[PDB]
Each structure stands twice: as structure tokens, then as C-alpha cells.
């Protein structure tokens, strides 16, 4: 009636490892999302290098 | 002057059946409507196989 038997292939013999699977990865990663202002281009800003 | 005994073949002298017409079905039946939002739509799926 039924197989109850499975040939599971993601099952570990041995007990060990939980899985046998590999975890694919996206090609995905993440950063904040902070972004320039800009805001010293209003004003004059002299470079002081003898004094 | 008058037809007054009509024969009558939708009425059943023996009783017990109100009438004895053939109910017809005329082929129309309905259903909920159920309108697909779709919504998944915006988001990628990312298949897995394997893994």
C-alpha cells in the first residue's frame, strides 16, 4: 500500500551531519543605505597648510 | 357552449405527486469567483533544486 521505506539521499548514514546539502548561495549582499548629503559646497573653505 | 371537462395530463387522479412535469436543466451552473491577486508577482521566486 505504501512504501514507508524512502531512499532518501539527503539523510546521512552515519548521523553526524544533520544534511547532506550544500546551502546554494544567491550572489546577494547587503549594506546600509546612507547616502552623501553634500553640504559643505555652500560655503568658502580655504586650505591652511603654513599656519 | 363551453369546453368545460378539459383533459388535463399535468394532473394525476391517483395523487400523491403535485404535478408530473420533466424538470429540465437548461446546462448553466455556477461558481465563486475568486479573482487572482497575483500579488507574488513582485518579488523574484529564486528556485531551488538540490540544495
Same mark, same amino acid.
Given at each position: 500500500s505504501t512504501?514507508?521505506?524512502?531512499t532518501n *539521499?539527503?539523510v546521512?548514514?552515519?548521523?553526524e551531519v544533520?544534511? %547532506?546539502?550544500?546551502?546554494?548561495?544567491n550572489?546577494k *549582499?547587503?549594506?546600509?543605505?546612507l547616502?552623501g548629503?553634500?553640504l %559643505?559646497?555652500?560655503?568658502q573653505?580655504?586650505?591652511?597648510?603654513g599656519?
Amino acid at each position: 500500500s505504501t512504501p514507508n521505506v524512502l531512499t532518501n *539521499v539527503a539523510v546521512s548514514h552515519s548521523g553526524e551531519v544533520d544534511s %547532506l546539502l550544500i546551502e546554494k548561495f544567491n550572489g546577494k *549582499v547587503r549594506e546600509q543605505y546612507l547616502k552623501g548629503e553634500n553640504l %559643505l559646497s555652500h560655503f568658502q573653505v580655504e586650505t591652511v597648510t603654513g599656519t
